[PDB]
Ligand binder design. Structure first.
Ligand SMILES: *CC(=O)NC1=NC(SC)=C(C#N)C2(CCCCC2)[C@@H]1C#N
Ligand SMILES: *CC(=O)NC1=NC(SC)=C(C#N)C2(CCCCC2)[C@@H]1C#N
Lengths: 304, 304
């Protein structure tokens, strides 16, 4: 029993972290096979970030201008290319610590672990979600760009995120491992405002099921509702609309607890309309939306 | 910017996790050098746990009765000994993945990361604190016993906890790496009730400083207080008494923010007396007490 915001074990990603320096700018890189992936703005100075033309700045860079350090050993760069907002540095040595991996572009509401890094060295690991406005509420200081987000399925690491930017509001923006930003963000130091950070309804429901499984059941009420009625309430409280796909995804949690998805929806509806009344659910005084239904299943069943 | 419940990168501990089987009971072990550490109740059946005499049960066990599996390879057990509530299995092979390590017995209020494991395989990593009643609010399912808690300083892993038990209330109890339980707990399936789970005052203050550093400053008020006045309020709200040692430990946070420790104490006092009034601090609707002052410094400064 007990329910925690759990991140995946980070060792498989720790063994891929390198330092990438180009001129005076240094950031984190990800060494997978004989390639190093890093934000393309490793070729920029702080002044360049105001209005960078990456194609023009990259013309003035050769393989030897990129320094890649793995721990303390220097990897020889034998090729370089820009792919969207990431640079791919072909090195002469395959990473001996390359785990089984895939690059995945996740959907909003999906969760992943971030291995926060500075100078190619790992400092911490935390769990977070791709917000519905395509930002992440990370914890990143200067020097963390290039840190990646990932999920682990048995022995396979699915890299889903690379840290590139911090918006003026303190939220973070980045790309998948193909260099495409999540959301409408750009790698430029210009005012980029995020849209409404709505709550991930299916995740709140999933966490409400985990609460029931762990004995926190005070919030369970005597009512039910329909998807349309629930959605009218969810729209009022800036919650994402719930779909039949989300109901199907909640199926195993509904089966395990004996609580119909729409019955939990009605419980959530009353919580939105009345508040927690000074009470907690799983040690939280607010409704948690950064546990997907699969995260709850994994944590409540013990998937290694 | 951004503040997250961050755990240490777990790779150095992942490479030490083994499976220990004795008869039909299997739990997690920690392989450091040529020794494997695990809960002594690996020699017990579920019936034995009702009233075990470990010394008597251990007489009927030889080196060959303990099976140790590292990933999938079988380590040869060449010695065994009981040290308090842990068994030490001397194996014929030194762990090639042994990081730099120390065994430390932590004080209540201290935080550490837990690498939750099942069958010697890691499933997740989370951050938690040794509560003032010597329990931990972990997340452990059947098969997780033997999972360890640790802190990392540069390249050195300080192991501080080993999971041994779940109390009837859902909280967890365990030992340091010398087999001594934190608190008055015993490795017996008998009713053990925990004492008052009080709030770690110095950690709440430390998290209030992290909030100020990250821009959440609504709670800062126009008052100050004394240690004695603050402590009268802290006693009323089941908060630990704050000492001059705790004030000294908060010194760097006080220096960085320009907020005197007793001024933050007065802010905390008003928060205890009025509540949050529906507001959040660092995305939390309650006061967080599982970040030590050192954790805040590390996260807000970028220690790898
Ligand atoms: C996202 C990020 O922080 N980018 C960085 N840009 C630049 S100039 C394009 C930097 C420089 N020099 C640093 C790397 C060194 C520390 C200061 C920021 C980063 C990073 N990370
Ligand atoms: C702390 C804990 O869970 N202990 C266990 N005891 C016993 S009997 C002494 C077990 C058995 N058999 C298991 C290990 C296998 C899964 C069921 C529980 C554990 C554990 N862990």
């Amino acid at each position: 029993s007990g329910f925690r915001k759990m991140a995946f074990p980070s060792g498989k990603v720790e063994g891929c972290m390198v330092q990438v320096t180009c001129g005076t700018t240094t950031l984190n890189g990800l060494w997978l096979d004989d390639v190093v992936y890093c934000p393309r703005h490793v070729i920029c100075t702080s002044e360049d970030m105001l209005n960078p033309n990456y194609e023009d700045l990259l013309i003035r860079k050769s393989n030897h201008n990129f320094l890649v350090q793995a721990g303390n050993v220097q990897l020889r760069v034998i090729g370089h290319s820009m792919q969207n907002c990431v640079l791919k540095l072909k090195v002469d040595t395959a990473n001996p610590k390359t785990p089984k991996y895939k690059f995945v572009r996740i959907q909003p509401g999906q969760t992943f672990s971030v291995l926060a890094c500075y100078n190619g060295s790992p400092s911490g690991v935390y769990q977070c979600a791709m917000r519905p406005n395509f930002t992440i509420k990370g914890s990143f200081l200067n020097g963390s760009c290039g840190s990646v987000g990932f999920n682990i399925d048995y022995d396979c690491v699915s890299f889903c995120y690379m840290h590139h930017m911090e918006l003026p509001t303190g939220v973070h923006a980045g790309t998948d491992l193909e260099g495409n930003f999540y959301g409408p963000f750009v790698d430029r130091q210009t005012a980029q405002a995020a849209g409404t950070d709505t709550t991930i309804t299916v995740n709140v429901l999933a966490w409400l099921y985990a609460a029931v499984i762990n004995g926190d059941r005070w919030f369970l009420n005597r009512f039910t509702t329909t998807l349309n009625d629930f959605n009218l309430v969810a729209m009022k409280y800036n919650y994402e609309p719930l779909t039949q796909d989300h109901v199907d995804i909640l199926g195993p949690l509904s089966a395990q607890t004996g609580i119909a998805v729409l019955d939990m929806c009605a419980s959530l509806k009353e919580l939105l309309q009345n508040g927690m009344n000074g009470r907690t659910i799983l040690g939280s005084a607010l409704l948690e939306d950064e546990f997907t239904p699969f995260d709850v299943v994994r944590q409540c069943s013990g998937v290694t």
